[PDB]
Design a protein around this ligand. Structure first.
Ligand SMILES: [Ca+2]
Ligand SMILES: [Ca+2]
Ligand SMILES: [Cl-]
Ligand SMILES: [Cl-]
Lengths: 121, 205
């Protein structure tokens, strides 16, 4: 009942900002708590943040991520967002969007984020 | 012998006398010892017309050490900024842009999709101790390597694990078939010097 597509990723420089978006094609988005996870080279997929159905509550993996990342949603646009500031090279990863409601879990295919200190310099 | 780069500058460096052919695969090995602690900087770089970041190994300031090929990046699992001598080998292949990182004879990781299908452009300049922003120049002191370098060699294939062990162990001394570490292939400039190097065992003490 859900087809999530992430976008907004790409090649960026250290210290820069980036805003991911994740869109459902359907029209029951507000049934779902939404989440962002990320998976870096040869590492486990890790939690970043989640947001309640109405967007009143949100949760971060830890205060380092909370310090620089903001999860939000716009139920009218069937979209969840991830604002990422002061990006580090260590933020490099495929970012995945994740929807949950009751016993149903849905995932997108992910969007690549590459943060490099040296590329371009 | 070793090359000595004693101070963070934009004017002292080594220069490999030979250029590179067009490479569909390579192995680059070297011994290094870095004094500098916010990052080892740039032990070597390869620049061509069109692309000054054609091959670069750089740990810039407090950032993860990166390999650039054609200005495309991978973070490597090298941990060599401890002020001790270490041996490293990097292998790479055009095919699927697959790389491997070896430290002291041990394979610490691999990755894919680094400049896949890009052959390395021939004819460029290999600089020791500096990062290039033009062919052979436009160095940046904040990116410079400070310390010592030895036994920098380049082959045009992916060496096998066992060959790397023997090189790391210095139980082999076979020179790079493309870039050999010999006196007349390594020019120094601006204060950089060359000196007899301790044996492999003396180093790791
Ligand atoms: Ca530079
Ligand atoms: Ca450069
Ligand atoms: Cl110059
Ligand atoms: Cl050979």
């Amino acid at each position: 009942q859900l087809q999530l597509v992430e976008s907004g990723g790409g090649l960026v420089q250290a210290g820069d900002s980036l805003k991911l978006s994740c869109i459902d094609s359907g029209s029951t988005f507000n049934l779902y708590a939404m989440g962002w996870f990320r998976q870096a080279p040869g590492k486990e997929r890790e939690f970043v943040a989640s947001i309640s159905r109405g967007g009143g509550s949100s949760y971060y993996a830890d205060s380092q991520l909370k310090g620089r990342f903001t999860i939000s949603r716009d139920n009218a646009k069937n979209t969840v967002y991830l604002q990422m500031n002061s990006l580090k090279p260590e933020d490099t990863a495929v970012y995945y969007c994740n929807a949950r409601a009751g016993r149903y879990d849905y995932w997108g295919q992910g969007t690549q984020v590459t943060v490099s200190s040296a590329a371009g310099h | 012998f070793k090359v000595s780069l004693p101070l963070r500058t934009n004017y002292l460096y080594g220069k490999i006398k030979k250029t590179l052919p067009e490479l569909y695969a390579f192995t680059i090995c070297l011994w290094l010892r870095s004094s500098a602690s916010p990052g080892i900087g740039t032990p070597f770089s390869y620049a061509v017309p069109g692309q000054a970041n054609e091959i670069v190994l750089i740990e810039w300031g407090n950032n993860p050490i990166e390999l650039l090929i054609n200005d495309k990046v991978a973070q490597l699992p090298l941990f060599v900024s401890d002020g001790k001598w270490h041996h490293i080998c990097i292998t790479w292949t055009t095919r699927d842009g697959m790389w491997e990182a070896f430290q002291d004879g041990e394979k610490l990781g691999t990755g894919e999709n680094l400049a896949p299908w890009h052959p390395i452009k021939p004819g460029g300049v290999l600089i020791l101790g500096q990062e290039q922003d033009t062919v052979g120049g436009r160095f940046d002191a904040t990116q410079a390597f400070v310390g010592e370098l030895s036994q920098f060699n380049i082959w045009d294939r992916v060496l096998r694990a066992q060959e790397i062990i023997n090189i790391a162990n210095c139980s082999t001394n076979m020179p790079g078939n493309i870039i050999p570490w010999v006196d007349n292939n390594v020019d120094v400039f601006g204060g950089a010097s060359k000196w007899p190097v301790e044996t492999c065992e003396e180093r790791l003490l």
